[PDB]
Design a protein around this ligand. Structure first.
Ligand SMILES: OC[C@H]1O[C@H](O[C@H]2[C@H](O)[C@@H](O)[C@@H](O[C@H]3[C@H](O)[C@@H](O)[C@@H](O[C@H]4[C@H](O)[C@@H](O)[C@@H](O[C@H]5[C@H](O)[C@@H](O)[C@@H](O[C@H]6[C@H](O)[C@@H](O)[C@@H](O[C@H]7[C@H](O)[C@@H](O)[C@@H](O)O[C@@H]7CO)O[C@@H]6CO)O[C@@H]5CO)O[C@@H]4CO)O[C@@H]3CO)O[C@@H]2CO)[C@H](O)[C@@H](O)[C@@H]1O
Length: 476
């Protein structure tokens, strides 16, 4: 009797590229590409396990633009320049960015504490601030290769900074290749999401929000987004086809969001399997185990992720010692293994790039200990998505209906329902009436609504600038 374990790491960034200037207004795609997007699948070169990944098409687009050297990244140009060439605004942007990341474990360099406690910084000190911001986002592979510059910790030269930058772009240029390789070798499956990561159930039917939050206010949806919902899915299939030469058979619905209509659309578009959240299962079926493969109306296969285990990695284990975290994780899998007579399928689904910066050493001790332990546990078999989809020796169940929701409390309140988020929907609804190009799809991405009307921290104004720019461009 085995326990089947399925890791599914979701990778996404909204489009940071301003449509009129072409400038990347935030550097997050760059930093998560050099730190996480290559290195998470690159663990498969050192550990004989299966790991699966989701890549949104919008993220793939930006990775390609950086690998081709066409990405005009405003924050990165402030990093690359000789400090004597920096504009006063670029120095402020560099300091603000450091301050935003200052308490993250990956930013624990003593030299950073010194620089941020100085009244003014000379050229030598700015070069360290530039280079240490680069090095704090160093991924596992180059952490081994650049160890001597990393342990230097201070006194960086322009030449050393440009060397690091060169190695980072080498990593980005190999990123889509590593996904093709692990896919070809059978080390994992690769999925995508509808193109700009929208909330498909809302696009299809905005009233589905009342299935879980009857008291919420939503704007007057005076146009139909149903066709744009088909578009996100179709163009995502095209983009995945471009990269991997095959149409995607698995999809990760953005924010785990499903509804009866969304599942029908995924089915009509040829999708054979997706996953969603455990809260959706419990809202939809009176008594239901998340360790079975589910068939929605015998149309499409659905797995419901293990919310606890997914949340443990995504939010808890950063605060633990690495060995104890893995002992806890393994112990829970042993309890699942012993508690059922059949072979349970356990789905661990979370973002693949956002939790590691809060772990010691960028999550590397945790993941190396976790993956080394998993690979030696006889009774655990990690599975590609394809294997989990086609696995014969598992338990299965048909379900006929789901209550619409997301993995945020099983509802849509992260993206609609307050004055500020509803204003974005009003802006999109009016813009959709006058839309003339696919920038209307960019504006339908979940991220713009996620950040809206939530507390004001640095650079969240940039998301508002991007959303409104895409909405304006969509009408020209
Ligand atoms: O002050 C309080 C605030 O402080 C901190 O937040 C800071 C950050 O520290 C700072 O670095 C910066 O954040 C940056 C970020 O660093 C950049 O990378 C970028 O963020 C990107 C991100 O990298 C992308 O992956 C993408 O995020 C999507 C994501 O792909 C998508 O899957 C989804 O994921 C979230 C989901 O919506 C949430 O509900 C939740 O999901 C959990 C559920 O909550 C839970 O219930 C569980 O069961 O399951 C779910 C999954 O595990 O979290 C998910 C996060 O993965 O949505 C996100 C967002 O759309 O895109 C974003 C960009 O949109 O940019 C940001 C912004 O600059 O700035 C912030 C604020 O200053 C602290 O970390 C944070 O906790 C505090 O709120």
């Amino acid at each position: 009797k085995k326990l089947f374990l399925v890791f599914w790491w979701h990778m996404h960034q909204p489009l940071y590229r301003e449509p009129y200037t072409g400038e990347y207004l935030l550097p997050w795609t760059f930093f998560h590409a050099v730190k996480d997007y290559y290195d998470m699948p690159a663990y498969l070169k050192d550990f004989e396990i299966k790991l699966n990944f989701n890549l949104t098409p919008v993220l793939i687009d930006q990775i390609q633009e950086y690998a081709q050297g066409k990405a005009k990244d405003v924050f990165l140009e402030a990093i690359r320049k000789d400090p004597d060439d920096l504009e006063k605004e670029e120095v402020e942007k560099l300091i603000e960015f450091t301050k935003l990341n200052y308490e993250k474990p990956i930013y624990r360099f003593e030299r950073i504490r010194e620089l941020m406690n100085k009244e003014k910084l000379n050229r030598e000190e700015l070069l360290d601030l530039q280079t240490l911001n680069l090095l704090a986002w160093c991924g596992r592979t180059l952490r081994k290769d650049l160890k001597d510059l990393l342990n230097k910790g201070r006194n960086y030269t322009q030449e050393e900074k440009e060397y690091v930058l060169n190695k980072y772009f080498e990593i980005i240029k190999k990123t889509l290749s590593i996904y093709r390789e692990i896919k070809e070798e059978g080390k994992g499956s690769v999925s995508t999401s509808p193109y700009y990561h929208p909330l498909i159930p809302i696009l299809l039917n905005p009233n589905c929000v009342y299935e879980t939050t009857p008291n919420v206010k939503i704007p007057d949806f005076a146009v139909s987004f149903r066709e744009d919902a088909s578009k996100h899915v179709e163009l995502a299939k095209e983009k995945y086809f471009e990269i991997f030469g095959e149409h995607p058979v698995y999809m990760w619905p953005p924010e785990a969001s499903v509804s009866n209509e969304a599942l029908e659309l995924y089915y009509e578009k040829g999708i054979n399997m997706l996953a969603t959240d455990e809260v959706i299962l419990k809202n939809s079926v009176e008594r239901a185990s998340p360790y079975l493969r589910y068939y929605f109306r015998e149309l499409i296969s659905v797995f419901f992720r293990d919310k606890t285990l997914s949340d443990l990695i995504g939010f808890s284990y950063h605060a633990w010692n690495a060995e104890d975290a893995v002992r806890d994780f393994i112990g829970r899998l042993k309890k699942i293994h012993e508690s059922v007579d059949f072979q349970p399928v356990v789905f661990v689904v979370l973002n693949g790039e956002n939790c590691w910066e809060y772990y010691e050493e960028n999550g590397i001790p945790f993941l190396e200990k976790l993956y080394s332990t998993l690979e030696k546990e006889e009774w655990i078999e990690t599975l590609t998505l394809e294997e989990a989809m086609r696995k014969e020796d598992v338990k299965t169940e048909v379900i006929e209906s789901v209550k619409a929701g997301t993995w945020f409390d099983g509802n849509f309140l992260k993206w609609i329902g307050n004055k500020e988020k509803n204003e974005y929907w009003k802006i999109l609804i009016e813009a959709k009436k006058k839309a003339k190009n696919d920038y209307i799809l960019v504006a339908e991405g979940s991220d713009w609504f996620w950040w809206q009307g939530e507390e004001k921290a640095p650079f969240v104004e940039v998301f508002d600038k991007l959303f409104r720019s895409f909405v304006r461009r969509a009408q020209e």
